[PDB]
Design an enzyme around this catalytic site. Structure first.
Site, mmCIF file in Angstrom:
data_model
loop_
_atom_site.group_PDB
_atom_site.id
_atom_site.type_symbol
_atom_site.label_atom_id
_atom_site.label_comp_id
_atom_site.label_asym_id
_atom_site.label_seq_id
_atom_site.Cartn_x
_atom_site.Cartn_y
_atom_site.Cartn_z
ATOM 1 N N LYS A 112 -9.462 38.954 -28.627
ATOM 2 C CA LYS A 112 -9.073 40.344 -28.697
ATOM 3 C C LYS A 112 -9.813 41.169 -29.725
ATOM 4 O O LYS A 112 -9.949 42.342 -29.516
ATOM 5 C CB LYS A 112 -7.551 40.523 -28.816
ATOM 6 C CG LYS A 112 -6.763 40.305 -27.549
ATOM 7 C CD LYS A 112 -5.297 40.586 -27.702
ATOM 8 C CE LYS A 112 -4.496 40.272 -26.452
ATOM 9 N NZ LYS A 112 -3.229 41.031 -26.286
ATOM 10 N N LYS A 195 -9.380 32.694 -15.996
ATOM 11 C CA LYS A 195 -8.013 32.973 -15.585
ATOM 12 C C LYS A 195 -7.909 34.410 -15.094
ATOM 13 O O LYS A 195 -8.605 35.304 -15.585
ATOM 14 C CB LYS A 195 -7.036 32.697 -16.733
ATOM 15 C CG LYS A 195 -6.729 33.859 -17.640
ATOM 16 C CD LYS A 195 -5.448 33.579 -18.420
ATOM 17 C CE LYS A 195 -4.897 34.835 -19.084
ATOM 18 N NZ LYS A 195 -5.617 35.205 -20.345
ATOM 19 N N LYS A 198 -6.424 41.194 -16.322
ATOM 20 C CA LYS A 198 -6.847 42.583 -16.194
ATOM 21 C C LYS A 198 -8.142 42.928 -16.929
ATOM 22 O O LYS A 198 -8.777 43.935 -16.616
ATOM 23 C CB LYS A 198 -5.726 43.522 -16.652
ATOM 24 C CG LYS A 198 -4.422 43.351 -15.890
ATOM 25 C CD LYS A 198 -4.539 43.877 -14.469
ATOM 26 C CE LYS A 198 -3.190 43.874 -13.767
ATOM 27 N NZ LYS A 198 -2.791 45.238 -13.324
HETATM 28 N N1 LIG Z 1 -3.741 33.957 -14.962
HETATM 29 C C1 LIG Z 1 -2.541 33.543 -15.326
HETATM 30 N N2 LIG Z 1 -2.059 32.410 -14.879
HETATM 31 C C2 LIG Z 1 -0.895 31.940 -15.216
HETATM 32 N N3 LIG Z 1 -0.050 32.601 -15.953
HETATM 33 C C3 LIG Z 1 -0.364 33.782 -16.499
HETATM 34 C C4 LIG Z 1 -1.678 34.323 -16.197
HETATM 35 N N4 LIG Z 1 -1.778 35.466 -16.814
HETATM 36 C C5 LIG Z 1 -0.649 35.658 -17.457
HETATM 37 N N5 LIG Z 1 0.199 34.663 -17.270
HETATM 38 C C6 LIG Z 1 1.537 34.578 -17.872
HETATM 39 O O1 LIG Z 1 2.288 35.713 -17.606
HETATM 40 C C7 LIG Z 1 3.161 36.000 -18.668
HETATM 41 C C8 LIG Z 1 2.889 37.380 -19.213
HETATM 42 O O2 LIG Z 1 1.606 37.548 -19.684
HETATM 43 P P1 LIG Z 1 1.235 38.630 -20.728
HETATM 44 O O3 LIG Z 1 -0.265 38.664 -20.897
HETATM 45 O O4 LIG Z 1 2.014 39.889 -20.432
HETATM 46 O O5 LIG Z 1 1.878 37.902 -21.962
HETATM 47 C C9 LIG Z 1 1.873 38.291 -23.306
HETATM 48 O O6 LIG Z 1 1.143 39.122 -23.631
HETATM 49 C C10 LIG Z 1 2.799 37.600 -24.259
HETATM 50 N N6 LIG Z 1 2.322 37.777 -25.617
HETATM 51 C C11 LIG Z 1 4.149 38.249 -24.109
HETATM 52 C C12 LIG Z 1 5.208 37.882 -25.092
HETATM 53 C C13 LIG Z 1 5.698 38.543 -26.194
HETATM 54 N N7 LIG Z 1 6.705 37.877 -26.746
HETATM 55 C C14 LIG Z 1 6.972 36.784 -26.095
HETATM 56 C C15 LIG Z 1 7.854 35.740 -26.230
HETATM 57 C C16 LIG Z 1 7.869 34.713 -25.335
HETATM 58 C C17 LIG Z 1 6.995 34.673 -24.282
HETATM 59 C C18 LIG Z 1 6.076 35.680 -24.088
HETATM 60 C C19 LIG Z 1 6.042 36.707 -24.983
HETATM 61 C C20 LIG Z 1 2.948 34.896 -19.722
HETATM 62 O O7 LIG Z 1 3.890 33.846 -19.652
HETATM 63 C C21 LIG Z 1 1.553 34.378 -19.397
HETATM 64 O O8 LIG Z 1 1.338 33.056 -19.831
#
Ligand SMILES: Nc1ncnc2c1ncn2[C@@H]1O[C@H](COP(=O)(O)OC(=O)[C@@H](N)Cc2c[nH]c3ccccc23)[C@@H](O)[C@H]1O
Ligand SMILES: Nc1ncnc2c1ncn2[C@@H]1O[C@H](COP(=O)(O)OC(=O)[C@@H](N)Cc2c[nH]c3ccccc23)[C@@H](O)[C@H]1O
Lengths: 330, 330
Positions: A112, A195, A198
């Site tokens: 990032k 993976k 976006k």
């Molecule tokens: N290509 C992919 N393949 C498989 N799984 C995926 C893929 N892209 C995304 N994910 C999963 O989707 C969830 C949300 O992703 P975020 O990027 O919003 O995810 C995030 O940005 C986190 N920081 C959000 C967050 C904040 N606090 C938390 C506490 C617990 C769990 C999660 C969070 C996630 O489970 C992520 O693993």
């Protein structure tokens, strides 16, 4: 109990197949016998600059997609991160128990930081995993269902909870990490070794839940495969073929080995055609529900108000417990 | 209006002359015509490990010393930082507008990191000035009265407020920094080139408000001077003599040039004797008030409860203003 917590950032107008299959699909399977808190993490979203009007709209649409993917507000709590002050209170405390070197070693931070550029990199991008740890620990969370990309951050959360408990025994629940095997990583359809995300460059390999279904079907028909003409599950040697099987299996419920056996004698044209058709059938009901939740907003606003109240009632008690152990005047 | 904010860490059983003369003395002079918020910053205290029982006791005793130094709860608001959630909420947001390099360049961080040792240095020690900026900006603060050692952190607070306002015009008040000339730095009595501080090594050069007055008088009589036998104000060439004049002037109210003129023909024995006597007269009434506030705690607890209520009423509105500008769902 069997308390569970998970979150998604409202950073775009649609979730993608990674979010739906790597995370929310498992949430749906867990909510009937696990006490679940599902969060739209708008505080995390602003670690990158966000347009305010879009951020508010996308907060709603992310929660709407939760409901449209099957999250049941009669069984689970859905709420907006910024509406529960306890998250930032616990984040401050946990920062006092997180190593500076520890935080700097997070892959997300480095990636990032590279995209934003240095001296343009902010404290919030650096403290991101500390707030994420607070999100989880505030609810005495026993299990956290996510995709693979969240593993390193949750290991920090566990490390920090253990370190805190070392000084203040029994204060915080150390959560278990629950990451599925098949859908841990849904891969981009044009570069099946990256993976689905976006920040891909172009969205030609990205399947958004709320995109025009015929457009998503097109992208799937153009998915990169190989030259083998053999439908067989092998993520290491056959990334694009395996990813398509993964996706079709996840949205249909058919086991892969059954799909693979049933694909004997077939070429990749039928694999892509069938996967595209299954995805179209998957997103059409989601879009219908999201459209109604957007056009008739009072229902979703009531769900989020109820969820914030219940989240505050739980998380504020965790904060007061933590504050008492630290010795703050109450 | 003429809103003012300032804070002290409850990290020891007593404030020292630096705190009293570099900060609280100016607070007392400002409170009658400035709307003042004076804070005991227990969230900052835990950026270093703290004994819980001591931290709670020292939070009370720090607020008690405010009252005993002349802070008037009928005219000013005294409260405990951790009791107002808005501080951590705004700290999270401001972290998203603070540069990582910017934070790493803070002198305090580097000094404090050196004492704690590296990989033992925590995120909270690094984000310290962001929470400090939040403390100030939460109250629409127009002026911040501190000693010189706080200047660099408040310049960050101003920089971050300006950067936020750049994207969201008119949201936060950019505070002015008010640092007195004479008492900007009270120096250690054994090393008059180092500022008086608890991390000195030994406390032989440190004057604690609540120490046995005869002990403080002893330390003053042993203060390092020079070989010149000339009482004259010159901090650069005559550090110890100038510091003693500074202290005696500040606790008596006599201008330095008047003290200096009145000291013609005198040696340093009389300078130290008189300064010791003035300090004893200064701390004896403070200690009497602190003893009563400690033995009869209901009065101070009511003051802090009232202050937390009023601080919450103001700071929560600032947070909601900031949250609205960012585009969070309210
Ligand atoms: N290509 C992919 N393949 C498989 N799984 C995926 C893929 N892209 C995304 N994910 C999963 O989707 C969830 C949300 O992703 P975020 O990027 O919003 O995810 C995030 O940005 C986190 N920081 C959000 C967050 C904040 N606090 C938390 C506490 C617990 C769990 C999660 C969070 C996630 O489970 C992520 O693993
Ligand atoms: N030797 C000295 N000579 C002159 N002045 C001195 C000396 N030592 C201390 N001071 C002043 O006393 C106040 C409190 O110091 P702290 O170290 O508790 O100060 C601190 O640790 C701050 N981070 C507390 C804080 C938190 N949030 C805030 C917002 C506004 C102002 C202050 C704060 C300060 O004004 C400091 O400049």
């Amino acid at each position: 109990s069997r308390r569970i917590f998970s979150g998604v950032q409202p950073t775009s107008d649609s979730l993608h197949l990674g979010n739906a299959l790597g995370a929310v699909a498992q949430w749906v399977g867990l909510q009937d016998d696990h006490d679940a808190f599902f969060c739209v993490v708008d505080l995390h979203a602003i670690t990158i600059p966000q347009d305010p009007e879009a951020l508010r709209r996308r907060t709603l649409i992310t929660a709407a997609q939760y409901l449209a993917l099957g999250i049941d507000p009669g069984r689970a709590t859905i709420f907006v991160q910024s509406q529960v002050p306890a998250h930032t209170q616990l984040a401050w405390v946990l920062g006092c128990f997180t190593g500076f070197g520890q935080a700097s070693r997070m892959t997300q931070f480095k990636d990032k930081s590279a995209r934003q550029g240095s001296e343009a990199t902010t404290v919030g991008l650096f403290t991101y995993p500390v707030l994420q740890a607070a999100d989880v620990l505030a609810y005495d969370t026993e299990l956290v269902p996510v995709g693979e990309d969240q593993r390193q951050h949750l290991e920090l959360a566990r490390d920090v909870a253990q370190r805190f408990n070392s000084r203040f025994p029994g204060t915080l629940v150390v959560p278990d990490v629950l990451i599925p095997k098949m859908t841990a990583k849904i891969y981009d359809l044009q570069d099946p070794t990256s993976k689905m995300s976006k920040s891909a460059g172009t969205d030609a390999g990205l399947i958004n839940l709320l995109d025009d279904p015929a457009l998503s079907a097109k992208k799937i028909r153009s998915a990169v495969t190989d030259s083998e003409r053999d439908i067989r599950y092998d993520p290491d040697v056959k990334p694009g073929v395996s990813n398509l099987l993964n996706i079709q299996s996840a949205v249909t419920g058919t086991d892969i080995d059954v799909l693979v056996d049933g694909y004997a004698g077939h070429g990749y044209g039928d694999l892509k055609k069938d996967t595209a058709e299954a995805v179209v059938e998957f997103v059409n009901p989601i879009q219908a529900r999201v459209d109604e939740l957007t056009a008739d907003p009072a229902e979703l606003e009531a769900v989020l108000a109820a969820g914030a109240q219940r989240a505050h009632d739980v998380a504020s008690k965790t904060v007061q417990r933590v504050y008492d152990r630290l010795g703050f005047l109450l």
